[PDB]
Structures are given as C-alpha cells and as structure tokens.
Amino acid sequence: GVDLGTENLYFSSNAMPHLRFRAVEAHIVESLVPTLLNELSSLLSTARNAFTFELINTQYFAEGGVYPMVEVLWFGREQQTQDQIAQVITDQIRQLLGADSHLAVVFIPLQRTAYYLDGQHF
Template identity: 45%
Template sequence: MRSLINDLMKGYYMPHIRMRAIETEQAAKISQVLLKELSAATKAAEENFTFELIETTFFADGKKTRSYPFIEVYWFDRPQEMQDQCAKIITNRVKEIANPEDVIVVFNKLSKTDYYENGSHF
C-alpha cells in the first residue's frame, strides 16, 4: 500500500502497455523483460503495470498484410526525458525479441481527472 501511495503522490501510477503485430509468445517474453526495466525507469511499482496483446489484422491495398510492432503506452504525463528513455527501452527489447526492422511506440497521456478506478478519478 505504501508503494501505491508514493506512486500516486509522484503521479507515477500505471502505465498500461498495449502491443500489436507481435506473436503471443513474443508478447509474453516482452512483458517479462520490460517490467523491471520500465519500473526502474518510471519509478512506478511493478504491480502498477499492465501488458496487453491486441490481436488484429492489418490491410494494405485491400489485402491482408503483416505489420511492424505497434506499441501504445497509456500513462499519466511524465517528463520528456523519461518518455524518451522508455521509448528506447521498449524499442530495444521488442527488436531483440521479435526481430522486426521497425518498431513504433506511441505515448497516450491521460488526464488524472479522466481516469477512473472503481468510480473515482485520480
């Protein structure tokens, strides 16, 4: 509980990480290796992270196609330096495990007044 309170006071509660265009086994491995590194980089407790694999189909010119990994990070606003560091960590680990040529990382900043847990915003 103390960890959660400290994280809330710093504003470093969550993030939620969503992955697309990655195999299930790769996503499991990525979530495992990213947890400790991102926790250290963001100063958020490991139990505050969630990882999600979104199964999706990509199309180009009307045909099914493969895509590069697309990673979305939903979190409360953090300093640019922290965001840059996390983007590098995510990119490096995804490239190491899934071996794609390109990796896209997108950060979605959430307002604490728009984020509700059990009916109450932060």
C-alpha cells in the first residue's frame, strides 16, 4: 500500500530531491551538506529527511579544467522555484570554492508513477 504514516510524503511540494555532487572535492561536499540541508529544507518547506546527498567518486577530464556539477534528481517544482534552488546551491558552493567558480546545477525530472517506495508508486 501507500505510506500514510509519514507526514506530508505525497505533497506536490515534496519533490524528493536527490543531490549528486560530481567533480567536487570530498571535503567541500562534507562541509556543504549540513548547510545546504538547512537552507533547502527551509526554502522548500520540506522535511529534512526528504533530501539525499551523494558524493560521486569518479574521475573527470575536460580541456580547460573540469567544473563542479550538482545533479538534482527530483519530481519537479515550477520554473521559478527551480531557479531559486539553483541559486542557493550555487551561492553555498561559491562560499567554499570562489565567487566566480563556475558551478553547473542540472535538474533531471523523475515521474512520480515510476518511483516506488516499499513497492508502491507516488
């Protein structure tokens, strides 16, 4: 069945964001995650346990140097909200990495009907 025990789980506002940090040093991410969780959960009025953060442990090459990227896999919020989230993530990373570092933030939409928790979709 569905999960009607956990508060506010199926709200449209609860985009269930999974943040994936690529081409970013581990210590930066470790410092970032607590402050990002504080700011995003407030901004989106979403439970703190609705977010997941992943450091991706791969090796990158690009001519001119590799820039950091955060992929956000989520159910979607309207463009204006998405824009604000991108701005929060960028601003926090700039604090640790430079006000002109060139962060990419990319949102990838997941379908609620293709996301299953304990065998039942959203």
